[PDB]
């Protein structure tokens, strides 16, 4: 193998400017990093700059360098959707025609009617809402009537809340499985179904650790599957295992924050493994992008950047670090949905003694998967062109 270990970091939603097909998605003008940098009056990301972020695109506080540490370019998304699952499935070698849907006006009557018909239970709510706010609003009615609180967020989710003393846990799980079946439909294609059991009384409801998430398998066997099948390590950090529904994963490390994600990355650097360590830094998307908070987003980017020199120090000669994103989520953009953007790509190994150069623009995110597959000598994905030989 060229590299013994590859560390792949997805900065979730960290887009680098509107894609050629942005107009189709209502995303003209979008620019996640660029708009953040303007808000911050210059983003302080000196380590990403050293890697070559400014060499991809110059932005406020982010300038090109004469000798970037590694190779750099951006990637264009080929799949139809601009969600997390689509972006990640494409990164690992797939092409996804069917987009996962978001529901700012709630779910279609047709879907909810069938859910009622299959379960024998009434549905209340049916709107985007905070999971804690909707319990204060509707939790008492739920307890009194045995109905189901169905709600959504800014992402592709269908969430079902029910009190554990009124609707038995095992019944809530059965209901969610029915919903998971019904939502495998492009009339109303939902990324995740989530059980949200709660306890307590009006004015004091608590959501329990009995939450369960019902994910879809990726629409194809991924490069992760092939790595696992060839007895390589595939270490998933953060939301990675959930995003792939565990497919191809050999170890999973839960994280509570971006800083905790970087700590687990450091943990994997300290492990003797051969294969892939795959981190998702989700805070950018979950806390700041959807909430349209450019200040919080900018601060989070600066906090992430400050962690990188320790990562640089621990990389071995036969390690490769890949940093990218899975879509955009411009915090100064109308609405609450993601944005269709190019994503940055930085590729760095300490073995790059003369620094890096510009790579040709990656025409699919699957180029990452192809590179990983070629490195480890496993079956090449159907889509994607490796850049391994360019490094
Ligand atoms: O805490 P809630 O408001 O119920 O749910 C918000 C998000 O919590 C989970 O990460 C899902 O991504 C949801 O979109
Ligand atoms: Mn838009
Ligand atoms: Mn994402
Ligand atoms: Mn999102």
In the chain, domain spans: 1-97+217-391, 98-216
User: Which ranges of the chain would DSSP assign to H, the alpha helix?
Assistant: 32-39, 46-51, 53-56, 84-91, 109-119, 133-145, 169-182, 223-229, 240-243, 258-269, 283, 294-314, 366-376
How far is Cα 334 from Cα 162, in angstroms, rounded to an integer?
33
- 131 Cβ closer than 6 Å to some ligand 1 atom: yes
Q: Return the CATH number of 1-97+217-391, one of 3.90.550.10, 3.40.630.10, 3.40.720.10, 3.50.50.60.
A: 3.40.720.10
Dihedral of the alpha carbons of 72, 78, 84, 88, in degrees to the nearest 10: -60
CATH number of 98-216: 3.30.70.1250
Distance 66 CA to ligand 3 centre (A): 31
- 159 Cβ closer than 6 Å to some ligand 1 atom: yes
How far is Cα 150 from Cα 191, in angstroms, rounded to an integer?
15
- 175 Cβ closer than 6 Å to some ligand 1 atom: no
- 277 Cβ closer than 6 Å to some ligand 1 atom: no
Q: At what angle do helices 366-376 and 84-91 cross, to 10 degrees?
A: 30
CB 73 within 8 A of CB 57: no
**Ligand sitting nearest the alpha carbon of 326:** 3
How far is Cα 92 from Cα 85, in angstroms, rounded to an integer?
11
CB 330 within 8 A of CB 13: no
Residues in CB range of 55: below 8 A, 6 or more apart = 64, 65, 68, 72, 358
How far is Cα 388 from Cα 371, in angstroms, rounded to an integer?
5
Q: Which atom of ligand 1 is nearest to the CA of 152?
A: 14
Task: Name which residue sits closest to atom 7 of ligand 1, judged by CA.
Answer: 153
> For the purposes of burial, counting CB atoms within 10 Å of the CB of 119, is it exposed (0-12), middle (13-18) or buried (19 or more)?
middle
Distance 286 CA to ligand 4 centre (A): 6
Q: How was this structure determined?
A: X-ray
Distance 25 CA to ligand 2 centre (A): 6
What tokens does 84 get? 């997390």
Would you call 261 helix, strand, or coil by DSSP?
A: helix
How far is Cα 103 from Cα 83, in angstroms, rounded to an integer?
13
| Resolution to one decimal, Å | 1.8
Which amino acids are annotated as binding site for Mn(2+), given as ranges?
A: 12, 285, 290, 326-327, 338
Distance 263 CA to ligand 3 centre (A): 20
Distance 12 CA to ligand 3 centre (A): 5
């Amino acid at each position: 193998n060229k590299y013994k270990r590859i560390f792949l970091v997805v900065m979730d939603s960290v887009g680098i400017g509107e894609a050629p097909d942005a107009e189709q998605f209502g995303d003209l003008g979008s620019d996640t990093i660029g708009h953040i940098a303007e808000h911050m009056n210059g983003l302080q990301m000196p380590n990403m700059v050293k890697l070559g972020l400014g060499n991809i695109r110059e932005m406020k506080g982010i300038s090109k360098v004469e000798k970037p540490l590694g190779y750099y370019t951006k990637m264009q998304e080929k799949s139809t959707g601009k969600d997390t699952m689509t972006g990640h499935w494409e990164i690992m070698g797939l092409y996804i025609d069917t987009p996962f849907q978001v529901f700012p006006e709630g779910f279609p009557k047709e879907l909810l009617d069938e859910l009622e018909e299959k379960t024998g239970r009434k549905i209340i709510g049916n709107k985007p809402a905070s999971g804690t706010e909707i319990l204060d609003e509707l939790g008492q009615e739920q307890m009194e009537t045995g109905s189901l609180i169905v709600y959504t967020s800014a992402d592709s989710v269908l969430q079902i809340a029910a009190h554990e003393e009124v609707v038995p846990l095992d019944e809530l799980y059965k209901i969610c499985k029915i919903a998971r079946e019904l939502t495998l439909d492009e009339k109303y294609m939902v990324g995740r179904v989530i059980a949200r059991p709660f306890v307590g009384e009006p004015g004091n409801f608590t959501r329990t650790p009995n939450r369960h998430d019902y994910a879809l398998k990726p629409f194809g066997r991924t490069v992760m599957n092939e790595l696992k099948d060839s007895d390589y390590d595939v270490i998933a950090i953060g939301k990675i295992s959930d995003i792939y529904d565990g497919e191809g994963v050999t170890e999973s490390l839960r994280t509570k924050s971006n800083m905790d994600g970087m700590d687990k990355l450091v943990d994997t650097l300290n492990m003797d493994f051969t294969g892939l360590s795959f981190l998702n830094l989700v805070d950018f998307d979950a806390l700041f992008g959807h909430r349209r908070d450019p200040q919080g987003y900018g601060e989070a980017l600066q906090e992430y950047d400050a962690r990188l020199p320790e990562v640089f120090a621990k990389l071995k000669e036969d390690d490769l670090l890949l940093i990218t994103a899975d879509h955009g989520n411009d915090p100064i953009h109308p609405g609450t949905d993601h944005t269709r953007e190019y994503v940055p790509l930085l590729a760095y190994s300490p073995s790059m003694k003369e620094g890096g150069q510009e790579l040709p623009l990656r025409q699919t995110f699957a180029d990452i998967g192809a590179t990983v597959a070629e490195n480890f000598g496993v079956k090449m994905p159907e889509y994607g062109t490796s850049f391994l030989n360019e490094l």
